[PDB]
């Protein structure tokens, strides 16, 4: 068997209870854009690229038992189901949470701007080349991704535009333009900050805390700062196990999901080498709901919202981190940024006329909501009497007139039949509402 | 002393439509050797050496500094910049070739050419808006009988004497 | 002095778009206004965009607003008008125009050859 997973999860632990079950693991880079174009018997991985993945076939449904489905929690089911079927095995739920320095600061800030002022008494860094952290800052004011109408998702709406992603942005670009946060910065250089205590807080998932563990520094984990009184919204992603449908070993590897990995051990194993954060299985989430870290990733879990599963969700990210990279670096505005993302997220473009919208903001911003408007449009438009009866010894035929009195309609009718050259008897019907003339 | 060098010798001069307006030795100015034209009305040059100064700073074109005087008609003087009938003060100008002049043409200074109705005296006019000249609404967009109210001086090298960047500073008193 | 060439267009299917070029020759691309004007066969021509350098930047017309836009470049002495989501109706000559006035009011109305661009359907 072989596994793929992201070089930040537990592979060693992984390697340990494929081992007890060969079992291959591996940990290639940029994963979630490799397996769609190489296409590993089983990948892991958030539940927002399954749904592309189930729509193009790359993952086989999986058939599941009802005792199994009582085993884990139903609304991880839920987030692994597309179209009303299961494609993956759900194992953890996790979600950004705000990791601080006991030494450094006695507590969390409350709000995000409390944090610039707490920042200038240092001299908060984390990683913003992936959206996935940057995200819970820009659609804590309202900034949604795809609006859910009563249980599904708005495709021809997107809500990156909205005054609240505004206000988002340009706070993070302000702090960026205070010399507070470097814009360069990733995943593994705020990691390394944050284990030598450089930096007093970030914010980071459960798969960080090991390292930290093993840095020995004192660390407290909580609510991500709230912005403009609005608690900030992190994507619940739900780590699951996708089985490829070209996999030779398909029924193996859903056996040893569902009867060795998915187990009290095997999660007990896998969350020793890296937390998992909240796990789907009931018996080891409830052993381990005690340890307070796990009930700061529900409670942010809870206020944040889950990633869709939806296929249109992939390219969205692309153009976010796009939008949030031209807001890091100061490339370009943030109106301009977020109008770039509204463009890149319509599916039904043509490439030379996403092209052109592209061009046509970049050198007017001042018709931005015009431009969008019309390429959205575009988008759209891409998507795949009375009757009288003559009886004459010459003429025979019918007329019919508009007239609102039968008087003025008889009258008429003689009138037409003199000028006609009919001199005769004349009998009227109203109920069929016919002038007869004959002779 | 009075500011001069910020007001004579600024590197930077608005339109003639945008004029710059500053509030506050003058024999030095009468016989600088540098001044085209030193007009004064209502006071003796020689005599100035008051509780209201108020300095213009404009460019204009060259056969067009005879309009800034006091009961005089035409484009600068009508849609632009207009002086009382009863000014004292006065009016000072000169050529403009060696900093207003680019090869291959300036054509960043600007001046009114339509208004609705002419301007009273000592006021400036920023409005940008699309000129009406028949009855049809513009709303705020071109077309027939609708037309951009500005229009850009062609201050190339060449030109002669009469088109040629004048700068022109009005000291009222 | 004054030369206004226009280039770019030619044939597009609707939906598509075009980039067209107006070089100027003579004077800076940075003056009062330098505007795109339209001219259908058999119609009158009429205004479609144009660029100033006070007030309002640019300024559209009704039926054009949105789909397209206009923009100068001072390094290259050009005006850009990008056209997106085009439609059949957009099937005309468009020139690039100034007004300039040479010294007695008269302006010339400064015309460029003229670009075709045919919207096919």
């Known amino acids: 068997l072989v596994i793929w997973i992201n070089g930040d999860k537990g592979y060693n632990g992984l390697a340990e209870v494929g081992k007890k079950f060969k079992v291959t693991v591996e940990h290639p880079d940029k994963l979630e854009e490799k397996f769609p174009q190489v296409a590993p018997d089983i990948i892991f991985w958030a539940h927002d690229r399954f749904g592309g993945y189930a729509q193009s076939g790359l993952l086989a449904e999986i058939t599941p038992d009802k005792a199994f489905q009582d085993k884990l929690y139903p609304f991880t089911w839920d987030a692994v189901r597309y179209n009303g079927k299961l494609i993956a095995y759900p194992i953890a739920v996790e979600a950004l949470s705000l990791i601080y320095n006991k030494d450094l600061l006695p507590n969390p800030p409350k709000t995000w701007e409390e944090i610039p002022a707490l920042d200038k008494e240092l001299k908060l860094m984390f990683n913003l080349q992936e959206p996935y952290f940057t995200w819970p800052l820009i659609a804590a004011d309202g900034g949604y991704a795809f609006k859910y109408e009563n249980g599904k998702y708005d495709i021809k709406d997107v809500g990156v535009d909205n005054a609240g992603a505004k206000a988002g942005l340009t706070f993070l670009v302000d702090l960026i333009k205070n010399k507070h946060m470097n814009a360069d910065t990733d995943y593994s250089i705020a990691e390394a900050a944050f284990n030598k205590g450089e930096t007093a807080m970030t914010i980071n998932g459960p798969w960080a805390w090991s390292n930290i563990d093993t840095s020995k520094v004192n660390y407290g984990v909580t609510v991500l700062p709230t912005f403009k009184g609005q608690p900030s919204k992190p994507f619940v992603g739900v780590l699951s196990a996708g089985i490829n449908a070209a996999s030779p070993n398909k029924e193996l590897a859903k056996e040893f999901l569902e009867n060795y990995l998915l187990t009290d051990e095997g999660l007990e194993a896998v969350n020793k080498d890296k937390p998992l954060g909240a796990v789907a299985l009931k018996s080891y989430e409830e052993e381990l709901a005690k340890d307070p870290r796990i009930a700061a990733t529900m409670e942010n879990a809870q206020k944040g919202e889950i990633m869709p599963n939806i296929p249109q969700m992939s390219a969205f990210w692309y153009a976010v981190r796009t939008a949030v990279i031209n807001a890091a670096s100061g490339r370009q505005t943030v109106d301009q940024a977020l109008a770039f993302a509204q463009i890149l997220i319509m599916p039904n473009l043509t490439e030379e006329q996403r092209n052109g919208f592209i061009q046509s903001l970049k050198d007017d911003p001042s018709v931005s909501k015009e431009i969008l408007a019309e390429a959205k449009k575009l988008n759209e438009h891409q998507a795949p009497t009375y009757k009288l009866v003559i009886n004459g010894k010459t003429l025979k035929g019918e007329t019919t007139t508009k007239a609102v009195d039968a008087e003025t309609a008889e009258k008429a009718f003689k009138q037409y039949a003199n000028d006609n050259g009919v001199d005769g008897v004349w009998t009227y019907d109203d109920a069929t509402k016919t002038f007869t003339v004959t002779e | 002393l009075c500011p001069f060098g910020e007001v004579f010798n600024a590197t930077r001069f608005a339109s003639v439509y945008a004029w710059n307006r500053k509030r506050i030795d003058y024999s030095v100015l009468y016989n600088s050797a540098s001044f085209s034209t030193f007009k004064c009305y209502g006071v003796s040059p020689t005599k100035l050496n008051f509780t209201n100064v108020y300095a213009d700073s404009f460019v204009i074109r060259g056969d067009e500094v005879r309009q800034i005087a006091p009961g005089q008609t035409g484009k600068i003087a009508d849609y632009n910049y207009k002086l009382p009938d009863d000014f004292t003060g006065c009016v000072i100008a000169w050529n403009s070739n060696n900093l207003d002049s680019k090869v291959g043409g300036n054509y960043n200074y600007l001046y009114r050419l339509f208004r609705k109705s002419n301007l009273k005296p000592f006021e400036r006019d920023i409005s940008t808006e699309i000129y009406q000249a028949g009855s049809t609404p513009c709303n705020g967009v071109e077309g027939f009988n609708c037309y951009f109210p500005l229009q850009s001086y062609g201050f190339q090298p060449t030109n002669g004497v009469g088109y040629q960047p004048y700068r022109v500073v009005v000291l009222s008193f | 002095q004054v030369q206004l060439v226009e280039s770019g267009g030619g044939l597009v299917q609707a939906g598509g778009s075009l980039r067209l070029s107006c070089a100027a020759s003579g004077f800076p691309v940075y003056r009062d206004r330098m505007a795109w004007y339209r001219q259908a066969p058999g119609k009158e021509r009429e205004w479609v965009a144009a660029?100033?350098?006070?007030?309002?930047?640019?300024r559209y017309a009704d039926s054009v607003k949105g789909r397209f836009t206009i923009s100068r470049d001072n390094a290259k002495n050009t005006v850009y008008l990008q056209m997106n989501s085009l439609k059949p109706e957009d099937t005309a000559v468009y020139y690039c125009?100034?007004?300039?006035?040479?010294?007695?009011?008269?302006?010339?109305?400064?015309w460029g050859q003229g670009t075709q661009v045919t919207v096919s359907s």
């Open positions: 125009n100034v007004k300039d006035v040479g010294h007695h009011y008269e302006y010339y109305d400064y």
């Open positions: 660029i100033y350098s006070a007030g309002q930047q640019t």
